[PDB]
Amino acid sequence: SNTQTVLPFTGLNTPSGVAVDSAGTVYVTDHGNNRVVKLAAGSTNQVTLPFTGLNTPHGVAVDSAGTVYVTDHGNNRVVKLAAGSNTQTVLPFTGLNTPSGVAVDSAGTVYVTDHGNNRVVKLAAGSTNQVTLPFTGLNTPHGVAVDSAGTVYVTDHGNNRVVKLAAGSNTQTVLPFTGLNTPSGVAVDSAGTVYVTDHGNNRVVKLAAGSTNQVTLPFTGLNTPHGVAVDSAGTVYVTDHGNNRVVKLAA
């Protein structure tokens, strides 16, 4: 599509992360209001999730059961909230410094970009021993995403590149993006196409699996965009952080 749609979120301030679940519900970290909000696919009615004590939150992720994970960036922690619950759980990630992106795979493993420590860390479901992924040479990384095979994609923001690591591998691969500047969010669809918020260039770019030639998506009027997400229909959602809005583009 050539026409983008501004979603009916309300009162957003410098929003950051965005995620979409398999039912099409859109979750957005409303960073400047210390809250996470959502819009179901069949709704125009925004709902605030009952997190508490958040401070400049960044990334957001959601699993199949509707459990929502948020990077509580200002408090150096990751918090999760089961659907409809008034219990939030601080995950046992330790030593975080200004953490940014968060992702969760089909097995419940949670991945966090520990931006201030130039590393990406993970916790398996129920685990209390955090594992640092053996990425090398990261500098101020931002976004993280995980595909259906457990391959982990990180936005190496300080080096203007996107790096991936297969599950269990010690050898990262730098994806053949070019011309990125301070990239932020990353997402991956079921065909392995990788979407990156090229934040410094106010655009979203995509790269198909096995391709070495990215293309810019026809979003318009973005300003310092942050998060990106893609649903099962190929619709792409971007947090237009500088314009306090979330925009979507159908394939």
Q: DSSP readout, the chain?
A: ----EE----S--S---EEE-TT--EEEEEGGGTEEEEE-TT----EE----S--S---EEE-TT--EEEEEGGGTEEEEE-TT-S-EEE----S--S---EEE-TT--EEEEEGGGTEEEEE-TT--S-EE----S--S---EEE-TT--EEEEEGGGTEEEEE-TT-S--EE----S--S---EEE-TT--EEEEEGGGTEEEEE-TT-S--EE----S--S---EEE-TT--EEEEEGGGTEEEEE--
List the Cα angle 62/66/72 in 5-degree steps. 45
Cβ pair 64, 22 in contact under 8 A:
yes
Q: How many CB atoms lie within 10 A of CB 234?
A: 15
Cβ pair 189, 206 in contact under 8 A:
no
Determined by X-ray
Resolution value in angstroms = 1.5
Cβ pair 188, 177 in contact under 8 A:
no
- Domain containing residue 55: CATH number: 2.120.10.30
Residues 6+ away with beta carbon under 8 Å from 232: 22, 189, 190
Total domains, the chain: 1
List the Cα angle 77/16/63 in 5-degree steps. 65
Residue 61 domain boundaries: 1-251
End-to-end CA distance of the chain: 6
125 vs 232: CA distance, rounded Å = 24
Q: Is 150 left (phi over 0), alpha (psi -120 to 50) or beta?
A: left
Place of tokens 């990180």: 154
